[PDB]
Paper text:
As a proof-of-concept, we screened the macrocycle library for inhibitors against thrombin, which is the central blood coagulation protease and an important therapeutic target. To overcome this, we herein established a combinatorial approach by tethering a myriad of chemical fragments to peripheral groups of structurally diverse macrocyclic scaffolds in a combinatorial fashion, all at a picomole scale in nanoliter volumes using acoustic droplet ejection technology. In screens, we identify nanomolar inhibitors against thrombin (Ki = 44 ± 1 nM) and the MDM2:p53 protein-protein interaction (Kd MDM2 = 43 ± 18 nM).
All inhibitory macrocycles contained the chlorothiophene carboxylic acid 14. The best three hits, M1, M2, and M3, were all structurally similar and based on scaffolds of the format cyclo(D3-B5-Xaa), wherein the amino acids Xaa were all α-amino acids with hydrophobic side chains (D-Val, L-Phe, L-Val). The purified macrocycles M1, M2, and M3 inhibited thrombin with Kis of 44 ± 1 nM, 165 ± 38 nM, and 125 ± 8 nM, respectively. Indeed, 5-chlorothiophene-2-carboxamide, mimicking the “side chains” of diamino acids acylated with 14, inhibited thrombin only weakly (Ki = 380 μM). The chlorothiophene group points into the S1 specificity pocket, and the macrocyclic ring fills the S2 (disulfide region) and S4 (valine) spaces. The structure of the M1:thrombin complex illustrated the contribution of both the macrocyclic scaffold and the carboxylic acid fragment to the overall binding and inhibition of thrombin. Thus, our crystallographic analysis further validated the approach of screening large macrocyclic libraries with diversified peripheral groups. We demonstrated the efficiency of the macrocyclic library synthesis methodology by screening and identifying a high-affinity inhibitor against thrombin (Ki = 44 ± 1 nM). A unique feature of the inhibitor is that it does not contain a charged group, and thus could serve as lead for developing a drug with a higher oral availability than dabigatran etexilate, an approved thrombin inhibitor that is a prodrug.
Author numbering:
A (entry chain L): 1C, 1B, 1A, 1 to 14, 14A, 14B, 14C, 14D, ...
B (entry chain H): 16 to 36, 36A, 37 to 60, 60A, 60B, 60C, 60D, 60E, ...
């Protein structure tokens, strides 16, 4: 449903996990 | 997971553990994609060559887990299966083509801080994200190496770049099809890592920078061992089989 993909302890609480930058930096 | 690290609490709330009832043993990874639909590799439930033919009653699906072993009260939820659906054109005789199955829980599961679905890709997300050099993330409780690390205490996580189809095809003698992609560092690249035994069926996920959501691009299917130089992990291409997923959900939901 409409909520998929956003993590209650991460996105919804505007926090970032330790290695998710690695991911974003690879799109560049 | 080889050369990864411990996952954070609720870092992967769509993570599902398939657990055999007897013996009381981890079977495979899986993911939650709705309140009643779990997605896995077909080879986790059906592989006649190893006398594997699990039915509804033989397993349970444990959601919201962190520890590999501990029952985690008021955090994990265990549900019973109503029905398994194996892709009808899944090819166990040859190359695990269309390595994908869906499981439908008996009753809906309660979302919480530890339990929450991942998104499936649409055309555009797929078209944007599935590109060599771009990294996805793999999670599971499988082995820390192929052969004093053995089995991890808690969910392991690793980030691996998608790999150009010709390099995937050159790395193995197995026929690799369009319903599959491969991922992993090249021997040159200085970094390493991979899934391993016990991680099959788990999700290969990517975070969209457009909308900050996580999408499951892949299912851990197979590799030639784990983290071997010159070898890559192979994943079922979730997009290419989305029609089947939609089809089954839309008919049995
Ligand atoms: C033909 C091919 C689809 C595959 N067939 C099968 O595995 C049939 C048994 S079903 S169980 C599959 C899962 N386990 C394996 O693949 C295991 C261990 N590796 C993994 O689990 C994964 C590593 C990276 C990813 Cl991604 S998964 N592979 C080998 O033992 C192996 C060790 C050496 C060679 C191979 C696997 C070659 N590959 C296979 O045999
Ligand atoms: Na490798």
């Amino acid at each position: 449903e409409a909520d998929c993909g956003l993590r209650p302890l991460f996105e919804k609480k505007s926090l970032e996990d330790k290695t998710e930058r690695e991911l974003l930096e690879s799109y560049i | 997971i080889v050369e990864g690290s411990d996952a954070e609490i609720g870092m992967s709330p769509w993570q599902v553990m398939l657990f055999r009832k007897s013996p009381q043993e981890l079977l495979c990874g899986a993911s939650l994609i709705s309140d009643r639909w779990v997605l896995t590799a077909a080879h986790c439930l059906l592989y006649p060559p190893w006398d594997k033919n699990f039915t509804e009653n033989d397993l349970l699906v444990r959601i919201g887990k962190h520890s590999r072993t501990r029952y985690e009260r008021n955090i994990e939820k265990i549900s019973m299966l109503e029905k398994i659906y194996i892709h009808p054109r899944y090819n166990w005789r040859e190359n695990l083509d269309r390595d994908i199955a869906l499981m439908k829980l008996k009753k809906p599961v309660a979302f919480s801080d530890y339990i929450h679905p991942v998104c499936l890709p649409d055309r555009e997300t797929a078209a944007s994200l599935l590109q060599a050099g771009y990294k996805g993330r793999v999670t599971g409780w499988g082995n820390l190496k192929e052969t004093g690390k053995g089995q991890p205490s808690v969910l392991q996580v690793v980030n691996l770049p998608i790999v150009e189809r010709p390099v995937c095809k050159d790395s193995t003698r197995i026929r690799i099809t369009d319903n599959m992609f491969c991922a992993g560092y090249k021997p040159d690249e200085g970094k390493r890592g991979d899934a391993c035994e016990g991680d099959s069926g788990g999700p290969f996920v990517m975070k969209s920078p457009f909308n900050n959501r996580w999408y499951q691009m892949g299912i851990v299917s197979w590799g030639e061992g784990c983290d071997r130089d010159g070898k890559y992990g192979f994943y079922t291409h979730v997009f290419r089989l989305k029609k089947w997923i939609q089809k089954v959900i839309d008919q049995f939901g």
